[PDB]
């Protein structure tokens, strides 16, 4: 060829994933449509990838998991989730179906079961998801040869991650994704030092919680143990972790009128290299012009990368006075539903911010980690923030320009077409978006048994 | 005159805060120097007001509160406090002798009696600081013609008052000083708006606990009530208050190996207009040269005034918007345990920073405050930090420049040489000096009866 395969960044295609869905069968079908989490944000986040794919077409390698399956019994959730919560989600999702057949709410009713569901499907979705994060992994770590490895990766995957605790669930998360990737990586490969970068519109209070966790204070879930000291902190282990989050601070989980001391203090936490934390927190403006938006990036919303490069300063001064190998990732908690396009607080992105921050996030990891990114699927929830937003932040993963006509409400609602179960074709923007929709529509063929029938 | 009395800084002089000392007359006297906050910081503090005046002696008023009291159960106390928290004080100062006689600690078995005394002087001493307090805010609000009042203050109390919290004491802070301060202005002259700015090098965790409450939030000490709604929250009522601290995140109250994670989150809040709540947190960076240090305040430091600036335009725009009249005050918490000089983890300031430090407070007063600014001592322990600290601060305040051999260690050593009760004389630096001690030793009458004798 002329592009290596090695230059290629990996797109990792989860069609376990689809299994998991809302399974509450007596309500209204609008109720119905205000659940956001669902099986078509992968058929939409396929359009995005078709449409990186139809634009680059020698940039990106597709890669599925199949039917790759990590347990729930792995060490990389056993020790990012305790084995309580792992036991007690498999038991939820054994009994679901029962309940659910004599119109009862299948999740604890301690839960707000309206921000949370399962079914006797879920278990195996996580499984599924699980291997298709060791996928991810191993697409940009695993081989002889050094040279001819990927640096670069993306997993489609839901349910997400980000909301879920150390032993808690919530927001629509079972399982946090970005923990378990990071401690597979850690186990399998010996990486040392991840950042978390999440753009996602809301707070990743989970995968801050599970940041506490790896720092050695006592989770909220444990039971009090003499582990730990009179200060509820024990020794920090490896791999170390840092967490760096932009979000609407007036948004779930703490949203305006509705929000707690404990989650608001959470997602306004700034503080590095101190008591084995490391997380930063910085809050979503609302703008109006093109250049209000570029103001506020470059003055504020940047210092997430001066902060990640900080910790990666600081982690190899650490290993290298200490006589260890330092390694490190940079993993993206890729959310899009702070785009413009995310259905109706005026804190929005332009479409091409996730091209712009990922051409950063770039720049982080060639300095601090050889180039490898990992970036995984959290919030998104319409077609036309999903399908715009992958495809803005896949251009920017292979580190190509952004043309804002790309992003026009004309060509994503073409795009979005392809979305409807039952699409049928009908100029130029028209011809290309039909060329993604097949494409799109295509890539997991079980998009037909969970959507198109 | 030439320069008129308005445009001169009043320096607040509190005699009854002598009284409140160490009690416990069984301790080795090694463990009794232990002992810190003492009455001696004040005579510290007359060298370094005595010091700025023989610079410039038509730039600052000297003012006495004297005999002056107010009461701990005054509105500007009990809406800082409750009335659970003064009415306990006073039960325990009333019980403190004859426990005292005993050999018995003073203070609740609950409370670290390392951190915190009392006695029945502890009362008269209250009283006589927060009659300082109103003396402070008065000097620079009260009268009839704007045009002959003072815009500026500093007030010299002890004890210091940003460990207390709005129930609960700690860290030598029985009674939170800024609070009742801010209280007191907006029950006498309609003050609507105040940021407080706190250079101490510790987290004024008990000055942002009780921003917490007038945010409408929960106190931990009070009871569960009605009175707030499913998250604990009720309305937020004037005035309102903004927090912003720069400190050492490894120090007390989260000594690095010593800290919870609940003071971890709190020492490290950054939050902006959401919520009820403006609350800034930024940690104090070691640094070696003066560029170094230049650097770090003109990149971290001075953002604290940029949100304090950002603070009030929100406030004058949601008052105008409301027609309401805005009236803002800028509060500083005045700690020198941050100087060079504070007795021996090497994140300091240099003495300079001080007067650089108030200047930018006045530019942010002028902008919004018509100038008003009250600064109120809180810790400092060392004769000469407290010294060099107060002095650069009152040279900062009446806006003049710092020259750097006035905080030399020759010039600074030379001053506390005054501060020992039984000092006596013995060349410029000298010659100075011991015009400095001759006034700073006779500024208050009773530092005779408490030290001297
Ligand atoms: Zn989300
Ligand atoms: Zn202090």
Same mark, same amino acid.
């Given at each position: 060829?002329?592009?290596?395969?090695?230059?290629?960044?990996?797109?990792?295609?989860?069609?376990?994933?689809?299994?998991?869905?809302?399974? #509450?069968?007596?309500?209204?079908?609008?109720?119905?449509?205000?659940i956001?989490?669902?099986?078509?944000?992968?058929?939409?986040?396929?359009?995005?990838?078709?449409?990186?794919?139809?634009?680059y077409?020698?940039?990106?390698?597709?890669?599925?998991?199949?039917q790759?399956?990590?347990?729930?019994?792995?060490?990389?959730?056993?020790?990012?989730?305790?084995?309580?919560?792992?036991?007690?989600?498999?038991?939820?999702?054994?009994?679901?179906?029962?309940?659910?057949?004599?119109?009862?709410?299948?999740?604890?009713?301690?839960?707000?079961?309206?921000?949370?569901?399962?079914?006797?499907?879920?278990?195996?979705?996580?499984?599924?998801?699980?291997?298709?994060?060791?996928?991810?992994?191993?697409?940009?770590?695993?081989?002889?040869?050094?040279?001819h490895?990927?640096? #670069?990766?993306?997993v489609?995957? #839901?349910?997400?991650?980000?909301?879920?605790?150390?032993?808690t669930?919530?927001?629509?998360?079972?399982?946090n994704?970005?923990?378990?990737?990071?401690? @597979?990586?850690?186990?399998? @490969?010996?990486?040392?030092?991840?950042?978390?970068?999440?753009?996602?519109?809301?707070?990743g209070?989970?995968?801050?919680?599970?940041?506490?966790? #790896?720092?050695?204070?006592?989770?909220?879930?444990?039971?009090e143990?003499?582990?730990?000291?009179?200060?509820?902190k024990?020794?920090?282990?490896?791999?170390?972790?840092?967490?760096?989050?932009?979000?609407?601070?007036? &948004?779930?989980?703490?949203?305006?009128?509705?929000?707690?001391?404990?989650?608001?203090?959470?997602?306004?936490?700034? =503080?590095?290299?101190?008591?084995?934390?490391?997380?930063?927190?910085?809050?979503?403006?609302?703008?109006?012009?093109?250049?209000?938006?570029?103001?506020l990036?470059?003055?504020?919303?940047?210092?997430?990368?001066?902060?990640?490069?900080?910790?990666?300063?600081?982690?190899?001064?650490?290993?290298?006075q200490?006589?260890?190998?330092?390694?490190?990732?940079?993993?993206? &908690?890729?959310?899009?539903?702070?785009?413009?396009?995310?259905?109706?607080?005026?804190?929005?992105?332009?479409?091409?911010?996730?091209?712009?921050?990922?051409?950063?996030?770039?720049?982080?990891?060639?300095?601090?980690?050889?180039?490898?990114?990992?970036?995984?699927?959290e919030?998104?929830?319409?077609?036309?923030? =999903?399908? &715009?937003?992958?495809?803005?932040?896949?251009?920017?993963?292979?580190?190509?320009?952004?043309?804002?006509?790309?992003?026009?409400?004309?060509?994503?609602?073409? =795009?979005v077409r392809?979305?409807?179960?039952?699409?049928?074709?009908?100029?130029?923007?028209?011809?290309?978006?039909?060329?993604?929709?097949?494409?799109?529509?295509?890539?997991?063929?079980?998009?037909?048994? =969970?959507?198109?029938?």
């Amino acid at each position: 060829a002329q592009i290596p395969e090695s230059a290629k960044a990996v797109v990792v295609l989860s069609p376990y994933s689809l299994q998991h869905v809302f399974p #509450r069968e007596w309500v209204t079908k609008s109720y119905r449509k205000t659940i956001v989490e669902r099986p078509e944000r992968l058929l939409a986040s396929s359009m995005g990838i078709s449409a990186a794919i139809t634009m680059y077409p020698s940039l990106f390698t597709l890669k599925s998991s199949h039917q790759r399956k990590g347990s729930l019994m792995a060490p990389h959730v056993l020790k990012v989730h305790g084995s309580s919560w792992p036991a007690e989600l498999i038991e939820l999702c054994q009994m679901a179906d029962a309940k659910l057949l004599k119109g009862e709410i299948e999740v604890p009713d301690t839960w707000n079961s309206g921000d949370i569901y399962l079914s006797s499907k879920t278990i195996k979705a996580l499984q599924g998801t699980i291997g298709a994060i060791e996928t991810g992994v191993d697409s940009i770590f695993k081989g002889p040869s050094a040279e001819h490895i990927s640096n #670069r990766a993306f997993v489609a995957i #839901r349910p997400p991650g980000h909301h879920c605790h150390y032993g808690t669930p919530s927001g629509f998360c079972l399982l946090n994704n970005a923990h378990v990737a990071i401690e @597979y990586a850690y186990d399998t @490969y010996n990486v040392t030092h991840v950042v978390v970068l999440d753009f996602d519109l809301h707070h990743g209070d989970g995968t801050q919680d599970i940041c506490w966790k #790896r720092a050695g204070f006592k989770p909220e879930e444990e039971p009090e143990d003499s582990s730990y000291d009179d200060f509820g902190k024990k020794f920090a282990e490896f791999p170390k972790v840092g967490y760096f989050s932009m979000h609407d601070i007036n &948004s779930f989980p703490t949203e305006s009128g509705f929000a707690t001391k404990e989650n608001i203090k959470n997602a306004s936490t700034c =503080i590095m290299n101190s008591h084995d934390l490391n997380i930063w927190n910085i809050h979503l403006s609302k703008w109006t012009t093109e250049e209000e938006f570029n103001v506020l990036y470059r003055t504020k919303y940047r210092t997430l990368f001066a902060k990640a490069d900080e910790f990666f300063r600081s982690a190899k001064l650490e290993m290298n006075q200490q006589g260890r190998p330092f390694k490190g990732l940079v993993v993206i &908690s890729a959310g899009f539903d702070a785009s413009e396009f995310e259905q109706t607080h005026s804190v929005n992105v332009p479409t091409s911010f996730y091209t712009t921050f990922t051409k950063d996030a770039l720049k982080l990891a060639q300095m601090h980690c050889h180039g490898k990114v990992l970036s995984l699927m959290e919030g998104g929830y319409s077609d036309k923030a =999903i399908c &715009s937003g992958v495809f803005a932040h896949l251009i920017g993963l292979q580190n190509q320009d952004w043309v804002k006509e790309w992003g026009s409400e004309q060509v994503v609602k073409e =795009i979005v077409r392809g979305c409807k179960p039952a699409w049928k074709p009908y100029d130029v923007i028209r011809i290309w978006a039909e060329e993604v929709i097949r494409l799109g529509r295509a890539m997991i063929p079980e998009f037909d048994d =969970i959507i198109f029938k």
